[PDB]
Swiss-Prot record, chain A:
This is Large ribosomal subunit protein eL21A. Belongs to the eukaryotic ribosomal protein eL21 family. Component of the ribosome, a large ribonucleoprotein complex responsible for the synthesis of proteins in the cell. The small ribosomal subunit (SSU) binds messenger RNAs (mRNAs) and translates the encoded message by selecting cognate aminoacyl-transfer RNA (tRNA) molecules. The large subunit (LSU) contains the ribosomal catalytic site termed the peptidyl transferase center (PTC), which catalyzes the formation of peptide bonds, thereby polymerizing the amino acids delivered by tRNAs into a polypeptide chain. Component of the large ribosomal subunit (LSU). Mature yeast ribosomes consist of a small (40S) and a large (60S) subunit. The 40S small subunit contains 1 molecule of ribosomal RNA (18S rRNA) and 33 different proteins (encoded by 57 genes). The large 60S subunit contains 3 rRNA molecules (25S, 5.8S and 5S rRNA) and 46 different proteins (encoded by 81 genes). The chain holds residues 96 to 156 of 160 of the full protein. It is found in: Cytoplasm. There are 2 genes for eL21 in yeast.
Curated annotation (Swiss-Prot), chain B:
Keywords: Cytoplasm, Isopeptide bond, Methylation, Ribonucleoprotein, Ribosomal protein, Ubl conjugation. The modification N6,N6,N6-trimethyllysine is found at residue 47. This is Large ribosomal subunit protein eL18A. It is found in: Cytoplasm. There are 2 genes for eL18 in yeast. Coiled coil: none annotated. There is a cross-link at residue 113 (Glycyl lysine isopeptide (Lys-Gly) (interchain with G-Cter in ubiquitin)). The keyword Ribonucleoprotein applies. Belongs to the eukaryotic ribosomal protein eL18 family. One of its GO terms (molecular function) is RNA binding. The keyword Cytoplasm applies. It comes from Saccharomyces cerevisiae (strain ATCC 204508 / S288c). One of its GO terms (cellular component) is cytosolic large ribosomal subunit.
From Swiss-Prot, chain C:
PANTHER family: 60S RIBOSOMAL PROTEIN L7, LARGE RIBOSOMAL SUBUNIT PROTEIN UL30. The lineage of its organism: Eukaryota, Fungi, Dikarya, Ascomycota, Saccharomycotina. One of its GO terms (biological process) is maturation of LSU-rRNA from tricistronic rRNA transcript (SSU-rRNA, 5.8S rRNA, LSU-rRNA). CDD domains: Ribosomal_L7_archeal_euk. It comes from Saccharomyces cerevisiae (strain ATCC 204508 / S288c). This is Large ribosomal subunit protein uL30A. Its main location: cytoplasm. Pfam families: Ribosomal_L30, Ribosomal_L30_N. It is found in: Cytoplasm. Belongs to the universal ribosomal protein uL30 family. One of its GO terms (cellular component) is cytosol.
From Swiss-Prot, chain F:
GO terms for biological process: cytoplasmic translation. Present with 51100 molecules/cell in log phase SD medium. PANTHER family: 60S RIBOSOMAL PROTEIN L29 (PTHR12884:SF0). There is a cross-link at residue 47 (Glycyl lysine isopeptide (Lys-Gly) (interchain with G-Cter in ubiquitin)). This is Large ribosomal subunit protein eL29. Component of the large ribosomal subunit (LSU). Mature yeast ribosomes consist of a small (40S) and a large (60S) subunit. The 40S small subunit contains 1 molecule of ribosomal RNA (18S rRNA) and 33 different proteins (encoded by 57 genes). The large 60S subunit contains 3 rRNA molecules (25S, 5.8S and 5S rRNA) and 46 different proteins (encoded by 81 genes). The gene is RPL29. Residues 1-21 have a biased composition (Basic residues).
Length: 61, 154, 222, 51, 170, 54
RNA sequence: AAAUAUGUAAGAAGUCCUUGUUACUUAAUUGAACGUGGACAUUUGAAUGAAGAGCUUUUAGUGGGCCAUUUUUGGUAAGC
RNA sequence: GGAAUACUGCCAGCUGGGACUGAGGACUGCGACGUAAGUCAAGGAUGCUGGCAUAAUGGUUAUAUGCCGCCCGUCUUGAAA
RNA sequence: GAAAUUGUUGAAAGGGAAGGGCAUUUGAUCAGACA
């Protein structure tokens, strides 16, 4: 009386595992087909030339 | 904490419960061979020496006749750990070598009459230290009167 | 017979080719760690000169230490504490930081204290309190040939190679960490610092995240 | 029979890690870096000293 | 503990279709580096919509005093949560550095008004440049010219449990 | 009278396992019109694999 | 329309090709089910853990419970 | 404009005092110094000296002192009752 | 000719109980080893 989404999403992800592996067999290169969780982000230089950080001073009441 | 229980016991046996003298000599011989020759045959036989009367069911001599019908196995020396019993239902029996503990006098006659020789387990290790060219049979266990371990739906 | 001294002279000579790999590879590590920290310090200085704010990358290795003892623990955290191999009180393992393991620590946060360890404490935990799990049984290291016989498949063939896969988290972090038995630590030698432990570290207590002050606390427990 | 700790008993420190000999020869831990006198920008200081 | 005044700078998230979120900075009195990052997300959540998961800390900087040995008169504005509803308070402190005056304010609120650390919000600490507009009185009595006062009845800390002198004061 | 105090803890001593999901599920319960053909389908496909493919 | 709690999926018993069966099905050898043959390997398909996993007998005691945090119902109330 | 020093951190930097333990019993292992024989703090303590050879240590038992110690068996949600 | 229970002698202790545990002092007593 239902039908399921999440399995049909897995069935589309197997097709992605075929084409990546078939391409990487042609041009010799690593596959990396396992998923990963979220990762901590990297270092990035942030320039405050556009916008000066404004002070807050938590007064209101 | 404790993830698992506690001091467990490996539920398997390490020594046979029998007080037979001659059986402990065969346990003494195969504990030598299993430690040294490292072929996986001896660990299977040594585990099979500790078993009870019920876990060693009798292998009928018609069951050895089935094992020689297999393709490319007409000269393997069959190894039974239990007893080999007679069976007068078959009529034509092969010529191979049987290695076992006990031979019933009806099954003793049928192998020697056909031509093959019957050999005990000490002469098995003298012939086959690694247990090359061997073939292990085990009798049936659910043919025992275990029709009675119950449920509402059988 | 033979082999009176004929094989010993070659077997001792074979280890001379073995120690030569370890000596020059650790030179490549010591060059890397000092160039790692110089480039970060230069990155802040080059950003202040250009008027920019150099943020750091987030740390990717925490070190979790159990604090509360063994009983009166609810069922949701007690399963999570067993998955990090943190059975007994004052024990510790290294945890790779993802989205997944950050939510595990977020459950057991009133029981553990964790932060980001430096190279110094990792060098001092592996040498003094490091043990190895060899087919079972927790064998202490005391030798490079023990690691080389068990992690030779994965690269690693000296004890500093084990450290390098811990701090510079590599592809083989999971297999190199699971080789380590969980650390057995004493009570801290100076004290916990504060009167009560079971408040948050922001509120003076001991549990929670402290991000650098784990390096002062482990050296007492080391 | 007995676990002899490294970081004391320097014989067992040289049992492991043979780089630890040449670490003491170049002294390698009390190292002086080549100094670079690079002054920070004026925008950073005026938000740091003042508000 | 000994407080340290910090400068904490926050930038919500570089996202698609909105690059460069604006920026925000605050001056935080706290004991160490770990509190003042967490005390930063306390106030800055109340002012607009970010969270600790939705935000990130750009940089922290420890602000030392511009002139330590010069003696300053400090006016502090304080919002604290009493047992009734909260209300403002203005107090004046004569002390040495900026971060040392907040040390003697949390003692002053805890002694007289029974306010803990978690109830008080330091609004703004400012230096009163010229005198004669010092509104309170207990700061003002130390500002007369040629101030001289003795210290009568001094005690003497004795190390022995017995002394044979029948001791006298000053 | 009735309570469920200490019942979840007794279930998690020997765990809560699955029905271990065999190959070849039992066709008892399937529509019999499918079962009656599927007998005759296997009886043919064992013949051609034995007669032809050898 | 939250929060906490809760069901399933994260591959070998898998994907893909060629074509084999039958009395079911289709207008139709089209499907459906199970296959032969061939290609796909340790990053074989998220994290961490696994002080072995799995199955089977056989029986002992027990079937008067109580307390705390939080949510609650009857009761003004309660060590009800 | 030039420093110094607090504070935090690092050292496979040096050196002095105190306490507890000596488990194991021919050889093997991994090493460091040396040009080599070898030696060495490197898979667990040896060398030197003194007193006494008996109630001296020690064992037992009686008492003294410091602290601790409600009466057993059973029924019970609950026993010193 | 056992124990409860008792007599004499000998030792010892004792301000509203007695008995016990860990540790030593004092007093009584005692085995072992030194060629």
């Amino acid at each position: 009386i239902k039908h399921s989404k999440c399995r049909q999403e897995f069935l589309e992800r197997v097709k992605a595992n075929a084409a990546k592996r078939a391409e990487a067999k042609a041009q010799g290169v690593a596959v990396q087909l396992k998923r990963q969780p979220a990762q901590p982000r990297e270092s990035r230089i942030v320039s405050t030339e556009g916008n000066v950080p404004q002070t807050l001073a938590p007064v209101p009441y | 904490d404790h993830t698992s229980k506690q001091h467990k016991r490996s539920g398997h046996r390490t020594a046979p419960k029998s007080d037979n003298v001659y059986l402990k000599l065969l346990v003494k011989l195969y504990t030598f061979l299993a430690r040294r020759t490292d072929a996986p045959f001896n660990k299977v036989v040594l585990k099979a020496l500790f078993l009870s009367k019920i876990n060693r069911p009798p292998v009928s001599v018609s069951r050895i006749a089935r094992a020689l019908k297999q393709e490319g196995a007409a000269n393997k020396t069959v190894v039974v750990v239990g007893t080999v019993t007679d069976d007068a239902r078959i009529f034509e029996f092969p010529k191979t070598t049987v290695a076992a503990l006990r031979f019933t006098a009806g099954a003793r006659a049928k192998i020697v009459k056909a031509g093959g020789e019957c050999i005990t387990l000490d002469q098995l290790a003298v012939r086959a230290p690694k247990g090359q060219n061997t073939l292990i049979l085990r009798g049936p266990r659910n043919s025992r009167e275990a029709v009675r371990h119950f449920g509402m739906g059988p | 017979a033979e082999q009176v001294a004929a094989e010993r002279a070659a077997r001792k000579a074979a280890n001379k080719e073995k120690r030569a790999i370890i000596l020059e590879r650790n030179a490549a590590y010591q060059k890397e760690y000092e160039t790692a920290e110089r480039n970060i310090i230069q990155a802040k200085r080059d950003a202040k000169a250009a008027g920019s704010y150099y943020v750091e990358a987030q740390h990717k290795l925490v070190f979790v230490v159990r604090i509360k003892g063994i009983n009166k623990i609810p069922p949701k955290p007690r399963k999570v504490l067993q998955l990090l191999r943190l059975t007994r009180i004052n024990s510790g393992t290294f945890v790779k930081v993802t989205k997944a393991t950050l939510e595990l620590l977020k459950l057991i946060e009133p029981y553990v204290a964790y932060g980001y360890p430096s190279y110094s404490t990792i060098r001092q935990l592996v040498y003094k309190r490091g043990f190895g799990k060899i087919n079972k049984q927790r064998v202490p290291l005391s030798d490079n040939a023990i690691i080389e016989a068990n992690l030779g498949k994965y690269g690693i063939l000296s004890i500093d190679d084990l450290i390098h896969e811990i701090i510079t988290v590599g592809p083989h972090f999971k297999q190199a960490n699971n080789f380590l038995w969980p650390f057995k630590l004493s009570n801290p030698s100076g004290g916990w610092g504060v009167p009560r432990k079971f408040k948050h570290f922001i509120q003076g207590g001991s549990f929670g995240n402290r991000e650098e002050f784990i390096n002062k606390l482990v050296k007492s427990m080391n | 029979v007995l676990k002899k700790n490294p970081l004391k008993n320097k014989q067992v420190l040289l049992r492991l890690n043979p780089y630890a000999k040449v670490f003491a020869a170049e002294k390698l831990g009390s190292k002086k870096a080549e100094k670079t006198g690079t002054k920070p920008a004026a925008v950073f200081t005026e938000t740091l000293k003042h508000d | 503990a000994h407080f340290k005044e910090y400068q904490v700078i926050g930038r919500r998230l570089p996202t698609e279709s909105v690059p460069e979120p604006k920026l925000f900075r605050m001056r935080i009195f706290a004991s160490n580096e770990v509190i003042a990052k967490s005390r930063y997300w306390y106030f800055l959540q109340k002012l607009h919509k970010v969270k600790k998961a939705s935000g990130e800390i750009v940089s922290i900087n420890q602000i030392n005093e511009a002139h330590p040995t010069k003696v300053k008169n400090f006016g502090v504005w304080v919002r604290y949560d009493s047992r009734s509803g909260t209300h403002n308070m203005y107090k004046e402190i004569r002390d040495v550095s900026r971060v040392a005056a907040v040390e003697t304010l949390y003692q002053d609120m805890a002694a007289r008004h029974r306010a803990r650390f978690r109830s008080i919000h330091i609004l703004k600490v400012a230096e009163i440049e010229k005198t004669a507009d010092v509104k309170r009185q207990y700061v003002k009595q130390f500002l007369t010219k040629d101030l001289k006062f003795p210290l009568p009845h001094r005690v003497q800390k004795s190390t022995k449990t017995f002394s044979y002198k029948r001791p006298s004061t000053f | 009278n009735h309570t469920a105090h200490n019942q979840t803890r007794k279930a998690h001593r020997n765990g809560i396992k699955k029905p271990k999901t065999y190959k070849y599920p039992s066709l008892k319960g399937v529509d019999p019109k499918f079962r009656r053909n599927h007998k005759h389908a296997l009886h043919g496909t064992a013949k051609a694999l034995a007669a032809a493919k050898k």
